[PDB]
From a paper:
Two fl rA3G mutational constructs (termed FKL and E/Q) yielded well-behaved proteins and crystals in different conditions that diffracted to 2.47 and 2.40 Å, respectively. The E/Q construct was crystallized in different pH and salt conditions but consistently showed the same structure and dimerization via CD1-CD1 interactions, primarily through direct packing of several residues on h6 (K180, L184, A187), loop 1 (I26) and loop 7 (F126, W127) from both subunits. While the FKL structure shows a canonical fold of its CD2 domain, the E/Q structure shows significant alteration in CD2 conformation, with major changes on helix 2 (h2), loop 3, loop 4, and the Zn-active center. The long h2 of the CD2 in the FKL structure has become a short 310 helix (h2′) in the E/Q structure, resulting in a disordered 14-residue stretch spanning parts of loop 3 and h2 (residues A246 to E259). The shift to a short 310 h2 and extended random coil structure is necessary to avoid clashing in this tight packing conformation. However, this also disrupts the conformation of the CD2 Zn-active center within the regions of h2 and loop 3 that become disordered, resulting in no Zn-coordination. When aligning the FKL and E/Q structures via their CD1 domain, the CD2 domain of the E/Q structure shows a rotation of ~29° compared with the CD2 of FKL structure, causing the E/Q CD2 domain to shift ~15 Å downward and ~8 Å toward CD1, and resulting in a much closer packing interaction with CD1. In the E/Q structure, the two domains interact mainly through h3, h4, and h6 of CD1 with h2′, β2, loop 4 and loop 10 of CD2. Additionally, E/Q* carrying individual mutations F126Y, K180S/L184S, or CD2Δloop3 (as in FKL structure) are all active, even though the activity of the FKL* construct (with E259A reverted back to E259) with the combined mutations is less than E/Q* and WT. These results suggest that even though the crystallized E/Q structure, lacking Zn in the CD2 domain, represents a catalytically inactive A3G structural state, reverting the catalytic residue back to E259 can fully restore its deaminase activity comparable to WT.
APOBEC3s (A3s) are an APOBEC subfamily in mammals that restrict viruses, including retroviruses, endogenous retroelements, Hepatitis B virus, and Epstein-Barr virus. The double-domain A3G, A3F, A3D, and single-domain A3H (haplotypes II, V, and VII) are active in restricting HIV-1 through deaminase-dependent and independent modes, with A3G being most potent among them. For the double-domain A3s, the deaminase activity resides only on CD2, but the catalytically inactive CD1 is important for regulating nucleic acid binding, processivity, oligomerization, packaging into HIV virion, and effective anti-HIV activity. In order to understand the structural basis of domain organization and molecular regulation of the complex biological functions of A3G, we determined the double-domain structure of rA3G.
Numbering used by the authors:
A (entry chain A), B (entry chain B): 4 to 142, 147 to 245, 260 to 383
The structure:
């Protein structure tokens, strides 16, 4: 019935835009075929729609954002229920729309999203690799379009007047390349040199101009914080990671998010995390910083406001460094090698942070 | 001094043949740049050579085989020592030369081989994916050529009259695609449907026209068989897997190879395994078969000769099926689901096999 719900796309346009040659510079355009269904998979689609946009900036107008706005205005016209949405999209999301869609999914317990992509946009770029990881951690099921998905998108969204889908040569080969790329980037862990150069707690003198943050989530069960090995992650920033964790899909109760950040939060980040833990009493926040970041501004007030709003803030010591090496680093069986003076630098930084957070004088 | 030992290749030829676009149908030819060094990495190369061939059949004349023959006659002209060999090869090995090189490496403790490949040949084909796995398990270090390796092969094997290497557009993007593909196929495990459709022990009535074999290796340490989790594997057939395990790389002394095969060995395979365990007293062989394969010929004599030569032969029961599901299958956390009548079919097959192996009558 999708054929009657949408204005189908020209066959030329489909063959041109959903060709899955990994590298294709010349295709300015993104096409997003979406179908909306109830949670019952047997049921037919309630609605479907084709969105289009350009890949280049003003991502406000990218088909993903158009979908979000349309869907928000669509759900208000039907009774509240649970939805399964499927996308066939010719390019995978940019970084901005990965963040947007991921926060939408993480805050909405009634939506499930499966994204089949024909090609990976900027698959070579660490920012977009991270963006896809963020999408997947928010709960979106990311997949490369295979022959079956191209066939189904032909049958449902393309004006292929009875004519069946005929594949181009190398469709499966492209699928193999792209699916391997997506899998490895989804399972990717931090490079060891990245880790040791960014989490070293000796006084800065080169690099380290970016912030790295690893995080784990635990849930309350029986007066006992029990971990969730499936909801870990690490992010690089050179709006607030708590907005990307789906506190709803997890075992229903209260949670403790433990954070390991190479630099202590900037002012903005501190205020965003404080606002989050204020409006989410079921989430406790623990922050471990490798170094204290002094922005010459209000960073002290930022940390103090974060602390007032319930976050526990400490400096990383050997235990936390070793945990992050063992959990978030592509270590290759090799053990954590502490650098010289780790514990002493950690104790001094702890004293500094103690002075920063202290309210009453003795 | 690799620009004095070899007849360097034309720059045109290098850029044409080492372009790393994954799909390149038109390149008939394989180029293999090899350098031979002592175990000391600081030391300069003792020798170097450029081999060429065609990708298409008569693999006797592929550059890998020409290297093997050249190297065999080269080692006889120098004192016995340990060698580190490096290849820069424009296409990765075919299946036949993967087998040849892998058995050469598995039988020779004094050679180390690193293969950098510009492109993956038939990366989409399960036979070639398995071939690369076989190479890696024999000990070859398989890697995709990156910018640094292209620069090296330019500097060492190409007549680039002082001119430096200048990369083509998309070299890193291609590297990302190819390296992800190589990693995924190197870590690939058996599809769940493949496993249960091929290892089901109820009487044949469809499919199962191929043999699947999973294997683990253990080493003797203080009268206690201790496993080697890094030397497992699984193979599909439509010469003998024992010739591909490097019984020299492992912690020395004696070993026990445990085999789980969907069909019991054909006559040929039984005789090859028997010949192997005869000429390798430090290796014990245990075989577990899911079904008994009756080739209308001498299969009974094959199993009896394998048993006479010291191999332990049994039929798989629940324990072995569950172990293979847990070890060699991409199960995704899902537990082994035994089919109905598994244990009873296993007991009947065990009775049949007992009758086959019985020598003295009671
Ligand atoms: Zn976008
Ligand atoms: Zn070959």
């Amino acid at each position: 019935q999708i054929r009657n719900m949408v204005e189908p796309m020209d066959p030329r346009t489909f063959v041109s835009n959903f060709n899955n040659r990994p590298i294709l510079s010349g295709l300015d355009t993104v096409w997003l075929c979406c179908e909306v269904k109830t949670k019952d998979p047997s049921g037919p689609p309630l609605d479907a729609k084709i969105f289009q946009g350009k890949v280049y900036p003003k991502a406000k107008y990218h088909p993903e954002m158009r979908f979000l706005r349309w869907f928000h205005k669509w759900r208000q016209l039907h009774h509240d229920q649970e939805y399964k949405v499927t996308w066939y999209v010719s390019w995978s999301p940019c970084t901005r729309c990965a963040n947007s869609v991921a926060t939408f999914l993480a805050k909405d317990p009634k939506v499930t999203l499966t994204i089949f992509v024909a090609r990976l946009y900027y698959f070579w770029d660490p920012d977009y690799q991270q963006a896809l990881r963020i999408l997947a951690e928010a709960g979106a099921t990311m997949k490369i379009m295979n022959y079956n998905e191209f066939q189904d998108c032909w049958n449902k969204f393309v004006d292929g007047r009875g004519k069946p889908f005929k594949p181009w040569n190398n469709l499966p080969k492209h699928y193999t390349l792209l699916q391997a790329t997506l899998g490895e980037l989804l399972r990717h862990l931090m490079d060891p040199g990245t880790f040791t150069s960014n989490f070293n707690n000796k006084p800065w003198v080169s690099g380290q101009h970016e912030t790295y943050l690893c995080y784990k989530v635990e849930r309350l069960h029986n007066d006992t914080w029990v971990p969730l090995n499936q909801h870990r992650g690490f992010l690089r920033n050179q709006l607030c990671f708590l907005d990307l964790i789906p506190f709803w899909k997890l075992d229903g109760q209260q949670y403790r998010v433990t954070c390991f950040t190479s630099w202590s939060p900037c002012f903005s980040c501190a205020q965003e995390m404080a606002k989050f833990i204020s409006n989410n009493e079921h989430v406790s926040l623990c922050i471990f910083a490798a170094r204290i970041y002094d922005d010459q501004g209000r960073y002290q007030e930022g940390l103090r406001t974060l602390h007032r709003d319930g976050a526990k803030i400490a400096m990383m010591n050997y235990s936390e460094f070793e945990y992050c090496w063992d959990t978030f680093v592509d270590r290759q069986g090799r053990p954590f090698q502490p650098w010289d003076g780790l514990d002493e630098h950690s104790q001094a930084l702890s004293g500094r942070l103690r002075a920063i957070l202290q309210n009453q004088g003795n």
